[PDB]
Design a binder for this molecule. Structure first.
Ligand SMILES: COc1ccc(-c2cc(N)[nH]n2)cc1
Length: 273
C-alpha cells in the first residue's frame, strides 16, 4: 500500500506536530511531504462526512483542501496501528517565513504588504470553509520561492469555526490574545486578528513585540525599527486590548497601508529571484 505508493526521502522536520519527511509520489514523480502523527499524542479527534474516527487535523484539512493554493493541500491519509500518516503537497524550492525573516532580517514594507495580504486571503478561505487555524505564526507559513506564493501549514491546533466562546487553547502563547491570558476565554475571529497583528509586527520589525504575559496584558507597542505611520496604525489596531476594538478582515484589507499590493509573481521577481 502506502510504502509502495511513495518513495521516502530525508526528514524535513519534527516537533509538537510530529515528524515530516520529504517524499515523491511514485506514479507521477510529484513532490510530497509525509507527516507521521503518533495516536497517543492526538488529543482532538473528529469524524469525516462518513463517520470514521480520525485526528481533527484530517477533518480540518479535508474541509479546506480544494483549488485555492493559499493552504497546503492534503493529498491522502493512512491509519497504522499506532499512528496516522498524512500525504501533503510539497512546493520546491520552499522556505518557511521564520527562516526567511531570520536570514534576511526585517522585511521591506512592499514585501510585508504582499505577504500579509496573501496570509489574510488564506485565513478568509479557512473561515469560509468553517475552519479556525488557531496557530497563525511565521513558522506555520511556507514561501513557494519561484511563484512568490505563501501557504498556511499545521492545522494540528485548529478547530471547527463557531460563534460562541472558546475555553481551550493549544497554539503559541506569545501569539495569544490578552483575553486568553487573563480570562482563558476568546472568540475565534478577534483572536485570529490579534495573532495577525503579532505576525505583521514580526514581518516589519524582524521579531515579535511581546515576550511575557505582563507585556501582552499591557499591550503597549514599541517600534524597534523604522516603520511607516500607516503600518504602525494597522498593527496597533489589530493589537487592541478589547476584542471588540479590533478591525474585521474587511477593515484590515481596506486599510490605507494595504492598498496597491503586488501580485505573487511580481513579488518573486522583485524580492525573491
Ligand atoms: C517542507 O514542506 C512541508 C510541507 C508540508 C508541511 C505541512 C503541512 C501541514 N499541514 N503540516 N505540515 C510541512 C513542510
Amino acid at each position: 500500500p502506502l510504502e509502495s505508493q511513495y518513495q521516502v526521502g530525508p526528514l524535513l522536520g519534527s516537533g509538537g506536530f510530529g515528524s515530516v519527511y520529504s517524499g515523491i509520489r511514485v506514479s507521477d514523480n510529484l513532490p510530497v511531504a509525509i507527516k507521521h502523527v503518533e495516536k497517543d499524542r492526538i488529543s482532538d479527534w473528529g469524524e469525516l462526512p462518513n463517520g470514521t474516527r480520525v485526528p481533527m487535523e484530517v477533518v480540518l484539512l479535508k474541509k479546506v483542501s480544494s483549488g485555492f493554493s493559499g493552504v497546503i493541500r492534503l493529498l491522502d491519509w493512512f491509519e497504522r496501528p499506532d499512528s496516522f500518516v498524512l500525504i501533503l503537497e510539497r512546493p520546491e524550492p520552499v522556505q518557511d517565513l521564520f527562516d526567511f525573516i531570520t536570514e534576511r532580517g526585517a522585511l521591506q514594507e512592499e514585501l510585508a504588504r504582499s505577504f500579509f495580504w496573501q496570509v489574510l486571503e488564506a485565513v478568509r478561505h479557512c473561515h469560509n470553509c468553517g475552519v479556525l487555524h488557531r496557530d497563525i505564526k511565521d513558522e506555520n507559513i511556507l514561501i513557494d520561492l519561484n511563484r512568490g506564493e505563501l501557504k498556511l501549514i499545521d492545522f494540528g491546533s485548529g478547530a471547527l469555526l463557531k460563534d460562541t466562546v472558546y475555553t481551550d487553547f493549544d497554539g503559541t502563547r506569545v501569539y495569544s490574545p490578552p483575553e486568553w491570558i487573563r480570562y482563558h476565554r476568546y472568540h475565534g475571529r478577534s483572536a485570529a486578528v490579534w495573532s495577525l497583528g503579532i505576525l505583521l509586527y514580526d514581518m516589519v520589525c524582524g521579531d515579535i513585540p511581546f515576550e511575557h504575559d505582563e507585556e501582552i496584558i499591557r499591550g503597549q507597542v514599541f517600534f524597534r525599527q523604522r516603520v511607516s505611520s500607516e503600518c504602525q496604525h494597522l498593527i496597533r489596531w489589530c493589537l487592541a486590548l478589547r476584542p471588540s476594538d479590533r478591525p474585521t478582515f474587511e477593515e484590515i484589507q481596506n486599510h490605507p497601508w494595504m492598498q496597491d499590493v503586488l501580485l505573487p509573481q511580481e513579488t518573486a521577481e522583485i524580492h525573491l529571484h
